A paper describes a structure:
About two-thirds of human TRIM proteins feature a PRYSPRY domain, also known as the B30.2 domain, in their C-terminal region.
Conversely, the TRIM36 PRYSPRY domain has characteristic loop insertions, which also affects its oligomerization state. The crystal lattice of the TRIM36 PRYSPRY domain contained four molecules in the asymmetric unit, forming two essentially identical symmetrical dimers. The dimer interface is formed by a helix-turn-strand insertion between the canonical β-strands 2 and 3 of the PRY subdomain. The total dimer interface area is 1803 Å2 for chains A and B, and 1875 Å2 for chains C and D. The same PRYSPRY dimer interface was also predicted in the AlphaFold3 model of the full-length protein of TRIM36, and the related TRIM46 homolog, in addition to the typical dimerization via the coiled-coil domain. An unusually large insertion was observed between the canonical β-strands 5 and 6, featuring an additional helix and a long disordered segment. Another noteworthy feature of the TRIM36 structure is a unique helical extension at the C-terminus. A systematic analysis of this canonical substrate-binding region in the PRYSPRY structures determined in this study revealed significant variations and distinct surface properties across different family members, providing intriguing insights into the divergent evolution of TRIM family members. This canonical binding site was accessible to a varying degree in the domains crystallized here, except for TRIM36.
Residue numbers in the entry: 506 to 602, 627 to 735
Write the structure that this text describes.
Amino acid sequence: MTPPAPVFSFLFDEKCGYNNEHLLLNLKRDRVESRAGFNLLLAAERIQVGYYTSLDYIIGDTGITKGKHFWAFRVEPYSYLVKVGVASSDKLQEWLRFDSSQPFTLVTIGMQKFFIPKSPTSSNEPENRVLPMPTSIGIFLDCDKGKVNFYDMDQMKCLYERQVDCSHTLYPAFALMGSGGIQLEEPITAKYLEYQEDMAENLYFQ
């Protein structure tokens, strides 16, 4: 099953209390960018050594309680440090100011590289800690099995797979630090339906 599950449709939650000094949502709320922001840059003469840069989290606007759900996104290749995965409401309150009984999961992206958190319970063959960043990354959350899988959509290949606690509501979760960007992707099937609509509604005579 190419997308292993039904495509889960959502947008970035403008109301989750994200840090809007450092994170900017685009007009559709389907892209988030990390920025230094005005307060830092207007005070930049004071910075000669460095600065404590917060990791700024944001979640999707729609929760998962049950079932199998898939979604995909593009991380900007230049991104300093980005995390992507899932998080329960409990964990979110910390971030927003055995594996199976851990209620979140994140992989780290940066420098156009995908970082595999760990490989336990799989001695088969030495696996890379660093992979090239896929132009498009997929997540499959299976609440029945309590598993989350991360996919390189360029190669159609699972990169990482982990037990996760689904006893409570889970949200698509993201975090950005330094400059970076994440764009939520729509399946090509959505594009072909958009085209039908544009031709049906918006094709006039001269």
